[PDB]
Design a protein around this motif. Structure first.
Motif, mmCIF file in Angstrom:
data_model
loop_
_atom_site.group_PDB
_atom_site.id
_atom_site.type_symbol
_atom_site.label_atom_id
_atom_site.label_comp_id
_atom_site.label_asym_id
_atom_site.label_seq_id
_atom_site.Cartn_x
_atom_site.Cartn_y
_atom_site.Cartn_z
ATOM 1 N N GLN A 130 19.736 32.024 49.173
ATOM 2 C CA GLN A 130 20.873 31.312 48.642
ATOM 3 C C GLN A 130 21.975 31.993 47.984
ATOM 4 O OE1 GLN A 130 18.317 28.535 46.337
ATOM 5 N NE2 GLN A 130 18.317 26.914 48.047
ATOM 6 N N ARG A 131 21.771 33.482 48.128
ATOM 7 C CA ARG A 131 22.763 34.195 47.310
ATOM 8 C C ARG A 131 23.932 34.212 48.220
ATOM 9 N NH1 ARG A 131 18.655 35.857 44.064
ATOM 10 N NH2 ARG A 131 20.056 36.553 42.345
ATOM 11 N N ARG A 132 24.912 34.677 47.200
ATOM 12 C CA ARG A 132 26.424 34.932 47.668
ATOM 13 C C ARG A 132 26.741 36.094 48.146
ATOM 14 N NH1 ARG A 132 29.247 30.055 48.062
ATOM 15 N NH2 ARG A 132 30.953 31.404 49.463
ATOM 16 N N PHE A 180 21.423 33.393 39.126
ATOM 17 C CA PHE A 180 21.827 34.506 39.986
ATOM 18 C C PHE A 180 22.659 35.458 39.285
ATOM 19 C CE2 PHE A 180 20.845 32.475 44.317
ATOM 20 C CZ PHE A 180 21.098 31.254 43.989
ATOM 21 N N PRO A 181 21.900 36.563 38.630
ATOM 22 C CA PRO A 181 22.328 37.633 37.362
ATOM 23 C C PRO A 181 23.661 38.350 37.954
ATOM 24 C CG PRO A 181 19.960 37.661 37.721
ATOM 25 C CD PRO A 181 20.526 36.883 38.938
ATOM 26 N N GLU A 182 23.714 38.528 39.208
ATOM 27 C CA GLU A 182 24.756 39.219 39.783
ATOM 28 C C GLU A 182 26.423 38.622 39.513
ATOM 29 O OE1 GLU A 182 22.455 37.857 41.442
ATOM 30 O OE2 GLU A 182 23.190 37.235 43.645
ATOM 31 N N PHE A 183 26.156 37.153 39.522
ATOM 32 C CA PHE A 183 27.272 36.452 39.236
ATOM 33 C C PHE A 183 27.793 36.838 37.869
ATOM 34 C CE2 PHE A 183 29.241 31.687 39.245
ATOM 35 C CZ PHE A 183 30.455 32.491 39.196
ATOM 36 N N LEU A 206 16.777 42.980 40.788
ATOM 37 C CA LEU A 206 17.334 42.446 42.156
ATOM 38 C C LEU A 206 17.251 43.068 43.238
ATOM 39 C CD1 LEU A 206 20.500 40.372 40.633
ATOM 40 C CD2 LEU A 206 18.216 39.343 40.867
ATOM 41 N N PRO A 251 19.975 43.903 35.358
ATOM 42 C CA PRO A 251 19.174 43.137 36.239
ATOM 43 C C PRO A 251 19.544 43.602 37.472
ATOM 44 C CG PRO A 251 20.633 41.966 34.487
ATOM 45 C CD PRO A 251 20.997 43.263 34.367
ATOM 46 N N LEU A 267 27.043 39.155 35.749
ATOM 47 C CA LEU A 267 27.441 40.533 35.829
ATOM 48 C C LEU A 267 28.800 40.747 36.149
ATOM 49 C CD1 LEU A 267 23.970 42.299 36.800
ATOM 50 C CD2 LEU A 267 24.817 41.980 34.635
ATOM 51 N N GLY A 316 31.513 26.768 46.946
ATOM 52 C CA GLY A 316 32.857 27.431 46.656
ATOM 53 C C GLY A 316 33.124 28.582 47.421
ATOM 54 N N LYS A 317 34.248 29.065 47.412
ATOM 55 C CA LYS A 317 34.842 30.290 48.458
ATOM 56 C C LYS A 317 35.246 31.511 47.564
ATOM 57 C CE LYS A 317 35.985 26.680 51.386
ATOM 58 N NZ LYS A 317 35.459 26.706 52.909
ATOM 59 N N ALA A 318 35.329 31.296 46.060
ATOM 60 C CA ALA A 318 35.821 32.203 45.414
ATOM 61 C C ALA A 318 35.138 32.429 44.222
ATOM 62 C CB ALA A 318 37.477 32.039 45.151
ATOM 63 N N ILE A 319 35.085 33.623 43.415
ATOM 64 C CA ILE A 319 34.891 34.207 42.253
ATOM 65 C C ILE A 319 35.999 33.600 41.291
ATOM 66 C CG2 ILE A 319 34.350 35.896 40.412
ATOM 67 C CD1 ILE A 319 33.425 37.657 43.079
ATOM 68 N N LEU A 373 30.412 37.362 48.297
ATOM 69 C CA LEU A 373 31.115 37.656 47.196
ATOM 70 C C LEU A 373 30.683 38.755 46.310
ATOM 71 C CD1 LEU A 373 31.821 33.844 46.378
ATOM 72 C CD2 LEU A 373 33.414 35.434 47.535
ATOM 73 N N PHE A 374 29.231 38.811 46.222
ATOM 74 C CA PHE A 374 28.801 39.832 45.461
ATOM 75 C C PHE A 374 27.803 40.883 46.227
ATOM 76 C CE2 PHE A 374 28.516 35.550 43.370
ATOM 77 C CZ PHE A 374 29.243 35.559 42.485
ATOM 78 N N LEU A 434 29.491 27.639 43.441
ATOM 79 C CA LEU A 434 28.966 28.646 44.589
ATOM 80 C C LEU A 434 27.729 28.630 44.953
ATOM 81 C CD1 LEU A 434 31.019 32.205 43.003
ATOM 82 C CD2 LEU A 434 31.687 30.653 44.970
ATOM 83 N N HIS A 435 26.725 28.378 44.188
ATOM 84 C CA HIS A 435 25.286 28.231 44.378
ATOM 85 C C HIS A 435 24.752 26.820 44.103
ATOM 86 C CE1 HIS A 435 26.296 32.282 42.880
ATOM 87 N NE2 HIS A 435 25.137 32.647 43.829
ATOM 88 N N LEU A 436 24.450 26.268 45.535
ATOM 89 C CA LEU A 436 24.285 24.907 45.210
ATOM 90 C C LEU A 436 22.854 24.567 45.142
ATOM 91 C CD1 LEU A 436 26.450 23.317 47.897
ATOM 92 C CD2 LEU A 436 27.066 23.899 45.534
#
Ligand SMILES: C[As](C)(=O)[O-]
Ligand SMILES: C[As](C)(=O)[O-]
Ligand SMILES: C[As](C)(=O)[O-]
Ligand SMILES: C[As](C)(=O)[O-]
Lengths: 304, 303
Positions: free
Chosen positions: A297-299, B170-173, A176, A172, B175, B146-149, A302-303, B124-126
């Motif tokens: 909206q991505r983080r 959000f697929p990265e999360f 992305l 993915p 993954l 949130g601030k943390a994985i 963190l990622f 994390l994602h609102l």
């Protein structure tokens, strides 16, 4: 406000000359139906019996491609109308590859414009090395060298194009990245297995579409492939026992919108070559992205 | 084989009534010999607006404390251990207020058989979305991200990665959670009807196939009544400003690492229900062995 795309489904043999005829016919039909770009599957030049066969056939692909470039310009000239072509082929290793002891073929997605000019050669990044459930052990890496580059976004007549090949669909982060770079349309030209096709083909296309809010194009090989090559079989001293093949591809070629809706799909009543058409809506794509602004909206903190 | 329970419910604004339902579902899960039970997002309450949420969040710590006691009580009474994964809210901390962050926390709690909170995952994602053919929602008006994985939890079922609702998109999360060692992922949710009908099943199966993990999908279901006479009086609200109706998709399910739906909510039962699944570690390992996705990633290019 709509842009017309053509997606081709076919059944590659080991005979490049016969495959080219099929390819040319489908491009001709795409121009007839006023498609701005036509997308053809992975390995539209050939499929092969084994890794040695692949390297042998890859030596014939440059000629196939030169002939295809000419066919495109001939067809554009005779129809008084432009079309661009995206098509999976193989290419032989380079001199530098050979110098480094790498004689594997390149699994390449070509983008060719209406002037027959090659704009992109995307070399497949993720190779299909998988033990198929109730099926064969497959190792693409035995015949194919992996790519080393992320493909540039293509400014096609349809909009911003993100290129990928087959197995690429399963990672993915690649899709992305393509969206992050500006893709509006993703393609996954494929020679997809029956066993994994039945399970995941539609799921993966729809998932990538919804993940990235892009139109997704899925040109697939279909049917039982005739991999026969008498002249090569003679040359490699192959017994009739080792000659046999039952390689089969999933087909089910389709087009998916940015909401995950299938808007065009191959007719299952034939296992021969066919073309599907879809009108892509930029306004719909933009609306979907506005209403659910995933890329705002991505983080990234963190990622990535 | 290890047995999981996935709960489907329908939160009102009444934390007392919601807690009764939650306790009943945990009790039912113990009866059915589930080792962990997973409950949806916002199992403590759902609110009418940002001001209602802030009011209700003040009551959440008592809800959590009473739940901790209820878990040890149920485990003791039934003579069987269970762990609980549950979506709740937390009010802003003292420090949050001083720093100008007067927003509630959307948190997924992992509570073990001893009633101990092992993890407090903050969403994390609102959910800031204009729902197609539905309402315009902005979660970040009342909720702080949130601030943390979240760390992988060594659960009785195996290695658990945790997430909340919108997080699924959000697929990265997902993954990253697999890269951290997840065998199981959960997405407790209050999912809309319009996006649910479109994407709920698709997204669950996709994440499962993407990560070669079991995926658990505990969802809110049906029409909510978020009425709260006491709050409505205190805030001097007119009846025209009341927003007490909400609808959730339900269709709670359990999905295997191959994308197969192995347990699913019964569409005929109205209100709170539980689905059970026996998870197979050997199937998981076999799937990963045959298609070694994590040995085949291009980190040289993407990470
Ligand atoms: C397809 As070529 C031989 O011009 O790289
Ligand atoms: C690696 As192939 C598409 O030539 O089987
Ligand atoms: C609408 As909410 C922040 O209680 O999931
Ligand atoms: C408007 As709300 C985030 O309290 O459902």
């Amino acid at each position: 406000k709509l842009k017309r795309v053509a997606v081709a489904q076919l059944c590659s043999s080991a005979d490049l000359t016969k495959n080219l005829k099929v390819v040319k016919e489908l491009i001709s039909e795409a121009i007839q139906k006023k498609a701005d770009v036509v997308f053809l599957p992975e390995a539209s030049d050939y499929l092969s019996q084994n890794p040695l066969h692949s390297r042998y056939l890859a030596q014939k692909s440059p000629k196939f491609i030169r002939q295809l470039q000419s066919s495109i310009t001939d067809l554009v000239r005779d129809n008084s109308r432009n079309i661009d072509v995206s098509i999976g082929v193989h290419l032989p290793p380079s001199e530098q590859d050979l110098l480094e002891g790498n004689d594997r073929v390149r699994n390449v997605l070509l983008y060719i414009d209406h002037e027959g000019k090659i704009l992109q050669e995307y070399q497949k990044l993720h190779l299909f090395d998988v033990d198929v459930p109730n099926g064969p052990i497959l190792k693409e890496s035995k015949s194919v060298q992996p790519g080393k580059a992320i493909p540039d976004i293509i400014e096609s007549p349809l909009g911003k194009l993100g290129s990928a090949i087959c197995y690429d669909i399963r990672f993915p982060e690649f899709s992305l990245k393509l969206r992050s770079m500006g893709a509006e349309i993703l393609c996954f030209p494929s020679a997809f297995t029956i066993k994994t096709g039945e399970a995941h083909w539609e799921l993966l296309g729809r998932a990538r579409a919804v993940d990235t809010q892009c139109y997704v194009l899925m040109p697939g090989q279909v049917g039982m492939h005739d991999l026969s090559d008498p002249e090569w079989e003679k040359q490699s001293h192959m017994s009739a026992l080792e000659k046999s093949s039952r390689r089969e591809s999933w087909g089910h070629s389709m087009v998916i919108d940015p909401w995950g809706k299938i808007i065009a799909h191959a007719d299952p009543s034939t296992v021969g070559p066919q073309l599907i058409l879809a009108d892509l809506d930029r306004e719909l794509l933009q609306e979907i992205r506005n209403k659910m602004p995933l890329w705002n909206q991505r983080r990234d903190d963190l990622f990535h």
